[PDB]
């Protein structure tokens, strides 16, 4: 339940050559997490690009969560339920499963400890160093106010 609000994802773990050459690019992306009920949340996600400030929306059903729009499963790897969460998504796009770990940060200034618990879970997948991007603060990027009709 504590797990409502605003987060940062702060780093991310993939091999992909797409990710591999454009990992130096990416930007931390601000998310905010609403639940509906118990087995249903959506996340807001706001990153900057370089076409803009992108905004987007998923919505995952139940530790293993599902979004039939972006065929993607989401595990939860890790997490205190307050600070940090270390996440491993795979998708799959036009026939091809791509797969990546994320870390979830309620600061912007993620953990040692956060962080340590990401690279140690990342390398047991085989991730190397290069694999994995600690990504630079944004702050013209944000997730839209909720506002709630009456």
């Known amino acids: ?9 702060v780093a991310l773990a993939s091999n992909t050559d797409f990710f591999l050459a454009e ?15 118990e087995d249903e949340l959506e996340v807001s996600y706001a990153a900057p690009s370089p076409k803009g400030c992108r905004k ?26 307050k600070s940090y969460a270390v996440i491993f998504a795979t998708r799959v796009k036009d026939g091809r499963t791509l797969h990546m ?6 600061s912007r200034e993620v953990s040692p400890t956060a962080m340590a618990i990401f690279r140690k879970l990342a390398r047991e997948r085989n991730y190397t160093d290069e694999m994995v991007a ?16 009456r």
Do not use: H, N
């Open 134 to 149: 600690v990504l630079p603060s944004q702050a013209a990027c944000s997730v839209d106010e909720v506002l709630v009709p």
């Open 56 to 81: 987007w929306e998923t919505t995952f059903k139940k530790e293993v969560y599902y979004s039939e729009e972006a065929e993607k499963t989401v595990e939860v790897l890790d997490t205190d339920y």
């Open 23 to 37: 990992k130096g690019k990416m930007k931390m992306v601000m998310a905010r997490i609403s639940f509906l009920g």
């Open 101 to 106: 770990m994320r870390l979830y940060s309620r």
């Open 1 to 9: 339940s504590e797990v409502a609000g605003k987060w940062y994802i």
